[PDB]
Paper text:
To understand the structural basis for SARS-CoV-2 viral-host protein recognition, here we use cryo-electron microscopy (cryo-EM) to determine a complex structure of the human cell junction protein PALS1 and SARS-CoV-2 viral envelope (E) protein. SARS-CoV-2 and SARS-CoV-1 genomes encode a small envelope (E) protein that is a critically important component in assembly, release, and virulence phases of the viral life cycle. PDZ-domain-containing proteins in cell junctions have been hijacked by various viruses to potentiate their virulence. Both SARS-CoV-2 and SARS-CoV-1 E proteins harbor a PDZ-binding motif (PBM) at their C-termini.
To study the structural basis for recognition of PALS1 PSG by the SARS-CoV-2 E C-terminal domain, we synthesized an E C-terminal 18-amino acid peptide (Ec18) containing the PBM. Nevertheless, we found conformational changes for two SH3 loops associated with Ec18 binding. One loop containing residue Leu403 moved as much as 4.5 Å; and the other loop containing Leu369 also moved so that Leu369 has a closer engagement with Leu74 from Ec18. Crb-CT interaction involves three domains (PDZ, SH3, and GK) of PSG, while Ec18 appears to interact with the PDZ and SH3 domains only. In our structure, we observed densities for 9 out of 18 residues from the Ec18 peptide.
Residue numbers in the entry:
A (entry chain A): 248 to 336, 345 to 410, 461 to 609, 620 to 675
B (entry chain B): 346 to 410, 461 to 609, 620 to 675
C (entry chain C): 67 to 75
The structure:
Amino acid sequence: QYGGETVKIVRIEKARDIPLGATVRNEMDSVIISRIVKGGAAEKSGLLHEGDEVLEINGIEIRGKDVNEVFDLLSDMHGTLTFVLIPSQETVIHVKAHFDYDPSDDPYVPCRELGLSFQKGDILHVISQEDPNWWQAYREGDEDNQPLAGLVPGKEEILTYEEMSLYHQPANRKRPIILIGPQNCGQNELRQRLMNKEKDRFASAVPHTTRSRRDQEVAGRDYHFVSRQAFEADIAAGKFIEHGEFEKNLYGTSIDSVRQVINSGKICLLSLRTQSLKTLRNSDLKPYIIFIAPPSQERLRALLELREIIEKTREMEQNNGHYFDTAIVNSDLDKAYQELLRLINKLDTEPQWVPSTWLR
Amino acid sequence: TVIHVKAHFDYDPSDDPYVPCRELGLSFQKGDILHVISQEDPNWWQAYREGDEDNQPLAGLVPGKEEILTYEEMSLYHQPANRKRPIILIGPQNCGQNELRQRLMNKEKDRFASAVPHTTRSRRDQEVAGRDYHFVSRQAFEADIAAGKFIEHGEFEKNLYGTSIDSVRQVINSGKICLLSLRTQSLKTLRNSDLKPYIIFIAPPSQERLRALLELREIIEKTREMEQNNGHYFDTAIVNSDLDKAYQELLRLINKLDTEPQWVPSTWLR
Amino acid sequence: SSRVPDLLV
């Protein structure tokens, strides 16, 4: 009964007419907790988490409904709560704005009661930068009686002029190549074709792993087996472009290994999530970022709800990404591949533009 | 010497009333590249474009809105007890700078002081080279511009003047807060060095009251020039009124700096 | 216009 899955029963105390600082979405036949808003009883108890779901609230089933009756139920009950759930699978940094913003005109915000309008020249407490596209914040001089938090756009520092310079690729120390884009628009096939049709002109970066040494991969041919203590020490030092736990072990990618590959006359290839760029630019690798994007819905459905969400996610990675230096519109595959080879061969006989910092 | 820059803000000169020709615009989109040829003008640089406009000589004018951010990192700061911050006044050339400066350091016997300038004029006996002036020959004086150790250096009758950056620090190491009177072209250096200043802005009043004070042309000129909202470096600004009334705010601020802490950009602290 | 965006409980 009640799904018969890994079930937990939790208790949270709620008064009358008091929001509980949780954001509930509505996707396929189930209700999903989406955010935890600080300063609310949910954060105080520190029990609920994002990604979970709901079965029944105070003994009344939930699955099979929309959000509005859930809202009506929660806005009419007080006292001790009873929730049924299955589990999931910082420090203040005062800032000062330099523009204007007003949520009621922005058709993009992931809620409408957490806007937090503010004029130019204010001061903000920022509490969490966890979701790197929407920060949680408090306006200075109003801290206590908000009472909850607010959301503010996560524009990274972007100037209104810079200083660029010409740069010529040397004879035999070639710049990396770094592909980014949405999750399901054929990056992997492109990588495999590039590494298979041409075999002696590309390479890769061997990662770090804290697993056990199986009897198929020896010393430095496929991994860099180490002890976990060194791994957390390196994370603290900040030597990792990207790192993520998986299966009780740790993976990643270093910065020395990329130098080993780039230091012998080959073109490194990679693939990244949109998070890591901030760490990559500040170093001196001198990357070259390429954005692979899908075309409109009609031709894509020709190629192969899910279409709409993929177009939407494509939209998000632009309008707050301005680093990269070229966009490839995916099409007939063996035309995008030709375009990619054209671009990469172009670098050898045509100088390029880099911010002048990377040379001083 | 040319400088290459890369824009980041869309701008179309179809209507912006501060361009003093109404048709020399060099409209461009976000992500273009400029070829700046002449920057000595405090505003309205002279610019090419990179692209189709290259064939013809451009020689256009582009707004000089120097680098400003979107988000910045700040920090709290308490004033020390023996190394106080300096005070610098900026404003349009006719509103009451000199009056406030002289009366502010004249009615407090030993609480304020001023730095000393470098001068290439003739050495004399009345002006002792230690108490007021810093007599130095011409060639070495001309040398230091290459290093860039000057706040602001003007020219007057074949003699060039300016102030050090070490005289200010020397006065800071004593008591007796030091005052100045700056020019808006020369902020970058004094905001980028480890000096930690405090900038306040003096503004002129509206047409009616100013006309009452001491025809329409100069009033229009002053209210136009007051629209130098190409700064916004400075912390706080006041508005002029009855002259023997501005003290209730000026002294309040300059003396209140002792008690409550202030905000400074996180760079200066570390 | 993804969905009705969200809701605060």
